[PDB]
Amino acid sequence: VSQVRQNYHSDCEAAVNRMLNLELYASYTYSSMYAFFDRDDVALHNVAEFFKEHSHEEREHAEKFMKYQNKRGGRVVLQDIKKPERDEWGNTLEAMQAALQLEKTVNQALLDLHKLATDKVDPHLCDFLESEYLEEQVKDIKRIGDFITNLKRLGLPENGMGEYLFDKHSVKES
Amino acid sequence: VSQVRQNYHSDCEAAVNRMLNLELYASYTYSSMYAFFDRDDVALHNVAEFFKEHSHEEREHAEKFMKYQNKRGGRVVLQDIKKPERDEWGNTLEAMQAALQLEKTVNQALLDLHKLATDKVDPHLCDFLESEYLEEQVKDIKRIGDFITNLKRLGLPENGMGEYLFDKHSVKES
Amino acid sequence: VSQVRQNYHSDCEAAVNRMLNLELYASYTYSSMYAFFDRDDVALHNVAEFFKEHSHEEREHAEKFMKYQNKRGGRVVLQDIKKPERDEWGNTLEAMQAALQLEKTVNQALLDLHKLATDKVDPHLCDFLESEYLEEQVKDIKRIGDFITNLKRLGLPENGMGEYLFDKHSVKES
Amino acid sequence: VSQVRQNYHSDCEAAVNRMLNLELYASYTYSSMYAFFDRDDVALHNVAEFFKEHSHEEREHAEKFMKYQNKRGGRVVLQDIKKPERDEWGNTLEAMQAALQLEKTVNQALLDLHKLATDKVDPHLCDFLESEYLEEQVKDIKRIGDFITNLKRLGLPENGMGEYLFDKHSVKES
Numbered sequence: 001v002s003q004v005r006q007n008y009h010s011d012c013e014a015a016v017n018r019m020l021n022l023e024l025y026a027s028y029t030y031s032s033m034y035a036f037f038d039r040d041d042v043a044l045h046n047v048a049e050f051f052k053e054h055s056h057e058e059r060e061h062a063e064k065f066m067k068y069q070n071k072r073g074g075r076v077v078l079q080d081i082k083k084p085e086r087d088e089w090g091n092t093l094e095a096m097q098a099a100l101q102l103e104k105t106v107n108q109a110l111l112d113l114h115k116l117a118t119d120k121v122d123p124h125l126c127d128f129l130e131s132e133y134l135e136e137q138v139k140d141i142k143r144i145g146d147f148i149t150n151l152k153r154l155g156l157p158e159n160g161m162g163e164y165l166f167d168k169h170s171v172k173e174s
Numbered sequence: 175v176s177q178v179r180q181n182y183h184s185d186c187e188a189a190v191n192r193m194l195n196l197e198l199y200a201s202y203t204y205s206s207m208y209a210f211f212d213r214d215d216v217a218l219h220n221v222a223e224f225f226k227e228h229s230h231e232e233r234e235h236a237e238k239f240m241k242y243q244n245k246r247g248g249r250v251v252l253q254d255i256k257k258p259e260r261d262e263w264g265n266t267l268e269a270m271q272a273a274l275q276l277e278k279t280v281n282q283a284l285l286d287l288h289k290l291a292t293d294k295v296d297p298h299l300c301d302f303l304e305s306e307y308l309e310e311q312v313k314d315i316k317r318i319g320d321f322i323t324n325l326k327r328l329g330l331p332e333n334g335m336g337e338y339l340f341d342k343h344s345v346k347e348s
Numbered sequence: 349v350s351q352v353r354q355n356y357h358s359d360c361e362a363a364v365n366r367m368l369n370l371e372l373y374a375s376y377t378y379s380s381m382y383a384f385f386d387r388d389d390v391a392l393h394n395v396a397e398f399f400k401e402h403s404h405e406e407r408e409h410a411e412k413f414m415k416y417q418n419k420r421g422g423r424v425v426l427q428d429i430k431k432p433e434r435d436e437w438g439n440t441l442e443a444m445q446a447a448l449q450l451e452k453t454v455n456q457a458l459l460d461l462h463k464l465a466t467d468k469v470d471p472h473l474c475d476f477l478e479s480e481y482l483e484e485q486v487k488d489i490k491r492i493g494d495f496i497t498n499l500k501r502l503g504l505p506e507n508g509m510g511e512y513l514f515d516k517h518s519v520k521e522s
Numbered sequence: 523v524s525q526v527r528q529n530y531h532s533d534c535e536a537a538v539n540r541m542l543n544l545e546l547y548a549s550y551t552y553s554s555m556y557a558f559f560d561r562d563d564v565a566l567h568n569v570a571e572f573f574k575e576h577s578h579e580e581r582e583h584a585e586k587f588m589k590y591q592n593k594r595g596g597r598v599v600l601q602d603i604k605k606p607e608r609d610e611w612g613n614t615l616e617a618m619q620a621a622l623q624l625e626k627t628v629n630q631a632l633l634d635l636h637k638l639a640t641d642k643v644d645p646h647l648c649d650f651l652e653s654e655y656l657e658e659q660v661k662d663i664k665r666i667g668d669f670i671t672n673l674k675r676l677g678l679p680e681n682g683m684g685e686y687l688f689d690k691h692s693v694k695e696s
């Protein structure tokens with residue numbers, strides 16, 4: 001047993017490792033989206049940079065779980081990071097829809113981890129999730145939903161001018 | 175009788191209370207418009223912020239009537255603030271048309287109060303309305319009319335790209 | 349269903365709308381207290397400004413619930429804002445006693461909403477209440493209790509000099 | 523006829539001269555109050571300075587009427603400035619009550635001049651009164667009413683401690 005360990009259930013330790021992997025998976029999917037929008041035959045560079053920044057955010061969130069694991073006396077166990085579900089992402093609307101689904105998948109895993117922490121009476125882990133993950137998750141889901149609404153308004157997928165305008169006005173100039 | 179009261183007719187005192195309520199009503203309608211444009215399935219955030227700022231303006235105008243009432247020795251009497259006429263506002267054009275009508279309703283009430291103050295020979299109340307309300311009212315009506323003209327030019331309600339562009343270019347970046 | 353909605357119960361959505369209304373109601377009551385203490389025959393201007401600032405605080409708290417509702421994919425539904433229970437507030441002690449009761453009423457509604465969020469296993473809503481409402485509520489209740497103790501010490505309601513001194517020393521100079 | 527004169531009735535010219543005299547009279551009354559509160563057996567120096575400043579304000583308002591008269595092509599005609607009604611002013615409450623009455627007397631004369639200007643269809647004179655006199659008059663009446671309420675609260679005339687405290691807290695430190 002780790003000398004620092006106190007009130008940390010084996011099930012929670014394992015679930016933190018699984019959440020670490022999921023964050024890395026999400027990061028990798030966002031990196032794929034970045035590379036797609038950077039292609040010469042796609043060429044939406046502000047959209048590309050949006051996804052690159054999100055990839056970096058998810059990687060940081062994975063690192064936070066590593067640090068958390070060690071703070072509680074658990075042990076980081078890594079698994080393969082699976083490649084993303086697609087090799088090409090269609091267009092800005094398809095990519096944003098996939099991003100929304102990914103953020104909701106990550107959110108569900110966070111909520112499930114909170115339920116486990118609650119069941120095992122681990123208020124430190126509950127606080128960590130609530131203070132570092134759950135609200136930023138809701139914000140990202142809202143942002144992407146707002147984007148999807150605007151992409152539909154702009155006539156995606158058919159309206160190329162609409163897609164061009166989204167890249168200039170909806171995502172930050174990079 | 176209030177020790178400060180001089181040349182202040184009971185009818186004007188009552189009409190100031192009614193105008194106070196109308197300003198609060200207008201504020202609440204603008205707050206509803208803010209919340210509508212902030213919805214994930216509407217997502218026109220500069221339009222939303224425009225209406226939020228107008229809600230704040232109307233609330234300040236209500237407060238100015240409270241202060242006025244007390245300065246003249248009248249007594250503030252509050253009534254329920256009725257909820258807005260609609261729960262959802264359609265789109266930017268429908269909302270701006272409702273805003274135009276609301277501003278003209280408020281303007282008519284101000285003009286009617288000026289007529290009453292004139293009838294009761296109350297130059298202080300006339301000056302207050304002319305100096306603090308009537309010109310800013312004309313400016314707001316002109317602004318909203320200009321917006322409606324541009325929304326029609328942009329092809330509202332059908333043209334979603336037009337609506338998107340209005341939010342980026344016609345209202346201030348928030 | 350809203351595309352952003354996840355783990356958000358209809359009961360919680362409805363209760364957030366009711367809490368929004370209660371915050372608006374509280375704001376309106378504080379505005380009435382402001383106007384009362386601004387009367388020429390009351391004339392306790394620092395007390396008046398204290399209540400004006402609290403009215404603004406409650407209005408901001410209502411707006412935060414609107415934003416919250418939309419972030420979760422719920423829909424803001426507004427109702428009439430009922431006028432305050434009294435048209436005149438007696439004196440500083442009576443007003444502070446009414447304020448204490450109002451803050452405890454709002455606190456109970458927040459605690460009841462937390463119980464509902466707990467029952468529906470909504471940790472995001474629990475965190476929102478704990479992080480944005482519950483502690484500031486306890487602070488406001490403590491502040492007003494402290495004031496009431498001092499008003500009694502100063503001989504309210506009978507001791508007019510005591511009431512005058514409270515306005516100069518206990519509430520911020522406005 | 524003055525080469526600049528246009529739309530300026532003889533009655534209004536005469537009434538402006540009478541208003542000039544009344545402002546000088548009011549100034550002189552406030553100077554008497556200053557001297558009273560500066561007495562070694564009264565010795566309320568912030569109250570004294572309040573009245574001194576008001577004397578200066580009224581003198582400036584008289585000068586503004588002189589300038590106005592000449593701008594319109596009327597002719598300034600001066601009369602004796604009558605001494606104040608009292609040689610001694612009792613205490614802070616009695617003096618403030620006399621000040622309230624004086625400000626309401628001046629206000630009535632301003633309102634009567636506005637009625638005359640209205641009857642003679644002189645919008646320039648109406649504007650001058652509304653823009654330079656009527657609102658500042660309402661503010662001064664409200665201020666003095668507020669003071670009287672507080673002096674009564676503080677137990678004037680009997681409560682000397684109350685009177686002492688008013689001088690320290692209600693009027694500006696001089």
Ligand SMILES: [Cl-]
Pocket residue numbers: 005006007008009
């Ligand atoms: Cl353990």
Ligand SMILES: [Cl-]
Pocket residue numbers: 007
């Ligand atoms: Cl334990």
Ligand SMILES: [Cl-]
Pocket residue numbers: 008009010011
């Ligand atoms: Cl264990």
Ligand SMILES: [Cl-]
Pocket residue numbers: 013014015017018077
């Ligand atoms: Cl593991």
Ligand SMILES: [Cl-]
Pocket residue numbers: 017018021022079
């Ligand atoms: Cl894993």
Ligand SMILES: [Cl-]
Pocket residue numbers: 078079080
């Ligand atoms: Cl593996």
Ligand SMILES: [Cl-]
Pocket residue numbers: none
């Ligand atoms: Cl596998």
Ligand SMILES: [Cl-]
Pocket residue numbers: 085086098
């Ligand atoms: Cl996919």
Ligand SMILES: [Cl-]
Pocket residue numbers: 085086087088
């Ligand atoms: Cl693919």
Ligand SMILES: [Cl-]
Pocket residue numbers: 101102103105
């Ligand atoms: Cl997914």
Ligand SMILES: [Cl-]
Pocket residue numbers: 015112113114116
């Ligand atoms: Cl889990």
Ligand SMILES: [Cl-]
Pocket residue numbers: 130131132133134135136137
């Ligand atoms: Cl968070």
Ligand SMILES: [Cl-]
Pocket residue numbers: 146147150170217219
């Ligand atoms: Cl957006």
Ligand SMILES: [Cl-]
Pocket residue numbers: 146147150169170
């Ligand atoms: Cl957008």
Ligand SMILES: [Cl-]
Pocket residue numbers: 179180181182183
């Ligand atoms: Cl009257």
Ligand SMILES: [Cl-]
Pocket residue numbers: 181633634
């Ligand atoms: Cl009159």
